[PDB]
């Protein structure tokens, strides 16, 4: 009915077909434009940079305390592995 | 019909074809410069570097858990292997 | 009944037919318009970087 409004205005101007597309009553071309182009651009498109900022929330949504604790625990694991290797080497002799 | 509006405006002005082309309705040049090139720039151009940057920022940016764990356990594994190899070499000679 | 207001306005305009949607929120098309899009744009959309 926006089409209807524009068509009425333009017929009052006097250019019916060759100055006014705005048809889509149930039209295959505009139906494809909405059910294939517009349908595939509204919901699935927001995954790029604009939504990739929120997609990067896997690394984000955290705190530096967790990273520091993980690094310290990994260092402790490294020290424990070194101690165990040295102990096994000593027991070998 | 956008081009139709432009053609009508130009013809009211008085320069229909040669001074103001504005037509480009459906030509192989128009087909390439509108229906091919625009798709050739819409998808791939905002798909390089930006996606890689998003993946990099979602990898470990401000999230040192996995990177720190792997880096610290790397030293542990390398040191254990080197110590075992050195012990075996000392045993051999 | 905002649709009623606009129907009255176009009746005063002279157009008898409702050739401007204002389509009866108690209609299946209006129900699909409201419950599907106007809602799935309200609660699930705020999951962006701000959310």
UniProtKB/TrEMBL annotation, chain C:
The chain holds residues 555 to 605 of 705 of the full protein. This is ORF.04.
């Amino acid at each position: 009915n926006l089409y209807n409004i524009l068509k009425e205005v333009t017929e009052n101007a006097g250019y019916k077909d060759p100055d006014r597309f705005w048809t889509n009553p149930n039209s295959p071309e505009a139906l494809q434009a909405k059910a294939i182009r517009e349908q595939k651009e509204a919901q699935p498109k927001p995954e790029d940079i604009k939504a990739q900022a929120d997609a990067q929330r896997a690394q984000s949504d955290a705190l530096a305390k967790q990273a520091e604790a993980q690094m310290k625990q990994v260092e402790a694991q490294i020290r424990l592995a070194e101690i165990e290797l040295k102990k096994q080497e000593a027991v070998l002799q």
